[PDB]
Symmetry: D3
Subunit: 270 residues, 6 copies
């Protein structure tokens, strides 16, 4: 249309469908091959689950193939067995990779057990750039505007790196490790805001009242390292899909403005 | 001076004369030849009308020549007849290019009738570079802080592209063209120097976001905080939402700049 | 830890010590030689005085050597005699360089008496790059958020350049030219914001109630050319060290957030 | 429902009708007599014209009578001829009082031609109190949050007083004096913010994008003398009716919150 | 010390103890009699439970007596049976009144099953006034700054009245009614903001991160009807007791400022 | 004009002169006699010194007489000798009362050595009312918006009362001196706002942020001066430096009110 895009739909399910379709459409138009595959960045968390389910379905109905899609994931804990049910390796396999025609060797996830964690990070960044860069990175946001383990105060140009988890993250993630703060791994490897920003296109899925304040900071306020999602304002091709509830802190006029862009870009004759 | 400059003058006429003189000063100082021409970016709309009248008047009175000035315009509607009175081509010729010693071939305006619109955008960006960049781009802003078709939410580093008009810009209504070609915020930012003319009470809130508030994609003009050499010239009405201290601060810079012994 | 760090200590003496120890720590671990020297950016003003005093003592107790350290300063006045007691050449020699085992040909300060000032600036930028860039730039901020002569409205990507001084700077600096505003040199040469941002690591020292507002704009408010320190939000490796008094306009939760990062860092097992 | 209400509708026509019906309802439920009349405060300006037209039709169609309604207007200019079309006296007669079954002696308007203007104001306040206060005051707001001639900087507790008009108000109101800025009277008599707040109930009509910023400062921002409308936060029984356009600066959540109050209020199983 | 006070302690347990002690100290110093009773206003919700526990202990230990204490509670649901486990009548008996030496006839709770609900509210305000006003009113606040059922948009000078509950109140209280929003009574009677602020003294208990935004809007931001607690800024004798977690949105300087007020208050050579 | 006024003049000396003439103007227009005296409330601190010097000059030039002016001051320290050079009594005497034809018995200052301090505050309130109220109260503000001892967090409707000083006031007033009096008696914001009219003098860059909160921001107990938004008849007089945090449009708005108030034909 000519600007950052905000797509507002009523429910979590509707945004999940819009997103899955959008990912399918980008890959299908690209038409990957063994020689020129599609490079896809993916999130974990509750946010992308509906999208994952919809993509599995489209794949079953042969509306999309992952044979020539190469994936990079955002992050993984340091010092967790790949087979631990709460590892992000397991999250991805059980929620997505097991159910689609993806090639095991096309899957890239940070190795939180590497001997040299600093090199593992540098190598991930090299691998991404060896493929020409991520074509589409899909992500989600936290209530404080974080993406991945890029927590408030993360540099707006940060790269893949070691991350010690702050108290808020250990608390929030503690529910996956039997309510026990002592059982959440202390550290993680994570792509940076800069890494994500290097993508040719960025899609963010946001839902619920608890992300409303953050969506306000992403959209309407100035670029600010306390709300690292605000970095997206600098990206050339970014899209945020939000449910109605995550818009409660936006101004009426902002919603109308982005609603009209979608209507006008529908009837544009191009 | 080594910082942004905000030039405040009592009226629309004062800022028109000031901006005309600045363009005229920049071009004379550089002394353009057929071999080394001056590369100038230009706006449309009502804001620069005054400037254009003054520039015409200085061209009659032999204070400047446009013989070796290459110009680039920001935009054009897609599908409109080039010679349609409402086209950007027509705006430029009728209000400026018809009254000055400019050469037809040194004029660059986007062709919204190109067979491939994307390539037209690509070539336009390639053309600017083939001259080694705009030297001075002059612009205006909307009350929502937009610069031409780079509207709120435009990427604070976008390039020349097809832009679909928002219903607000559309308002007959079904006669207006649905799409435009436009340079990007990044295209403008590439310029060696950027001058923005702002006038009137309705631009005051935009000016405040441009100057005092943080870099924000809802106010396109705020991308200028990141440019190395930006000047804003504003009349008094457009300053009504600035702090007294901001005004005194930028006024002092002007006096100290005037008296720096350089 | 993988974010901006804010180190808060009770007094100006504590941060002075903290900063000296940090500088010493980075030089000692790099272990510079004649072929591989450490590149150090430095500030003037009263901010770093305590740090300089501590670095001097550490040098006397042989806990650090400046023999293979190359320094670049932020600024100098245009048209002041090098040996004038108020020049920044004199500031640096008298408060610091006179007192450490630094080699004189390793010291770089902008020459405000150079025939072609625009070229002096270009050359200073070229000299920094000839060494491969500044490895640690230490800076201080003004009550209005300025660093060095990058005053409000300095471009957030500014380079080394001629700068005309504003009244507030002339008035403030007039104390050192016997309270006469007219004895203050009118222009200076200064490194830009981008120049400081090019450094691998930036450390900012902040003290006192009259910097509280500026620290707030630096840490909590969006990137903004009126508060040029806010540009550090975009830096990959920035640390701010502050006394308690300069934190008064931050939120309680902000201080606790950055205090927790520090404690986690210490307890991450890395 | 025991809170402020904000009633949002698509257009100026919708809110005008809604406001007319609300007024009709309060009057009909009160059921006034000569001994016990209904006391109604009214504004001028363009905001209430729709409401006035609707109130005339309701009157013609026997759904409301004004026989026992006593009115007090907000303001009148000083030194304008009572019978000149540009006066608030004439505005009220031409747009409203001429077309309804009101009794002439029950109409109250500030006398901008009184010998002692200060005493005129004091008498106005006493006359309001003499009837037991205003039961419903209808007002509008300006783009800067002003009500009547209570311009930004007016005391949040102001009473009826002499008011010297600012250039901004003269420019705006010149639309009512053939665009001639020098035809606008320099001074006005006006009820105060306090006077308005003494009303049992207040109804405010707001429309258009150019009032959006004012509505935000009325609803979402703190009590502030630069936005005199914000004073209603202190009123016991305030209603604002707004078209959609005037809501553009409110948070989505604010609209959703007041919409839900209307929904809950109607479905609350009470009388 | 002549200003609002903000007492910051580490935990909920500390503030509960501080609040209980402060109530006992006020009642003991007044030293009430049958002829001259202490008039005490009280909240429900989880906030005051700590305080209630402490007061019961103090009472058993004869460190405070409720024999000549008249109480008024904030609110009660409409159309709930007094015996219902989740009524406020029961909350108060079960968590407080059953365990102390209070006289049953000295206990005043709004009657949500009254035939004329308006008269009930009116009679509640009259009764408060018949005793010369509330001497100390204790309250808490919600995450949106509400107090009692004085939800956002409630008038800053509101009195006792029927309140239709909004979506977020219904959702938050659904946890006490089988997690089913359709079981939560739709309406309540509630004292107003004006009713609370009529008290000689107001003591507010705040705890937890989820109250941090509201406390900031209470302490630092302008008087604003969307954060009804901010009205305390106009009260002459207001105290807030907060745990450390509820202070996360306040400025470092605000916390230091009120902490210093407490040290200087303690060390002032007056009592 | 029927709104608050903001009078802006270039310098401290200009606003002191403006404030002095405004006080002489209100007094002279009232034309006080012993039977109907003029009731005046007054400030201390550095702010009004200029105004006090100008009113002394006006008094010697026979342009005003204080014979039938009853004054009330805002505060006084608890447990200081009135004769102490740093007491509020001594400040007023030495900076104003000694130099003008005021009657000694027409002068009111809180007695910080009263045996019952609370009764002293109540009695001060009663005395103000006994005269039928203050007709004009002159005040100043601090950088944090405080009005004398009515400091951040004071009730926007506070009355005369005992006030315990903060560390900042004990520190800032240790130059004028641990031997600082820890408490003071002070009139309240509510007390000041009972006046028929209030004039506030604001000077210097360090009060610019306070002036912004007074005028453009909502009523807020952290900025005591904002309470004036509720007063029926408030005037602020300010030099240019203290307007630095106001919007251009606010300055031009109030300047136009000052122009229209001159040219109104009333």
């Amino acid at each position: 249309p000519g600007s950052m895009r905000l797509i507002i739909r009523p429910t979590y399910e509707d945004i999940s469908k819009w997103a899955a379709n959008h990912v399918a459409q980008k890959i299908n138009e690209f038409s990957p091959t063994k020689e020129n595959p599609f490079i896809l960045g993916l999130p974990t968390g509750s946010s992308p689950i509906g999208m994952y389910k919809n993509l599995i379905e489209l794949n079953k109905n042969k509306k999309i193939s992952f044979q020539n899609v190469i994936t990079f994931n955002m992050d993984e804990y340091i010092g967790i067995e790949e087979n631990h049910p709460e590892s992000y390796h397991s999250f991805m396999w059980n929620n997505f990779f097991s159910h689609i025609d993806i090639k095991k060797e096309n899957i890239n996830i940070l190795n939180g057990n590497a001997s040299n964690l600093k090199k593992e990070c540098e190598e991930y960044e090299k691998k991404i750039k060896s493929f020409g860069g991520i074509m589409l990175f899909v992500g989600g946001i936290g209530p404080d505007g974080h993406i991945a383990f890029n927590e408030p105060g993360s540099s707006l140009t940060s790269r893949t790196r070691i991350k010690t988890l702050t108290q808020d993250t250990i608390i929030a993630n503690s529910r996956f490790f039997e309510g026990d703060v002592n059982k959440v791994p202390k550290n993680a490897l994570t792509v940076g805001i800069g890494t994500i920003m290097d993508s040719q296109e960025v899609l963010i899925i946001v839902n619920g009242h608890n992300k409303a304040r953050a969506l306000k900071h992403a959209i309407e306020k100035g670029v600010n390292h306390m709300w690292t999602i605000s970095a997206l304002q600098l990206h050339k091709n970014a899209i945020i899909v939000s449910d109605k509830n995550a818009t409660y802190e936006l101004k009426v006029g902002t919603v109308e403005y982005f609603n009209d862009i979608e209507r006008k870009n529908f009837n544009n004759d191009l």
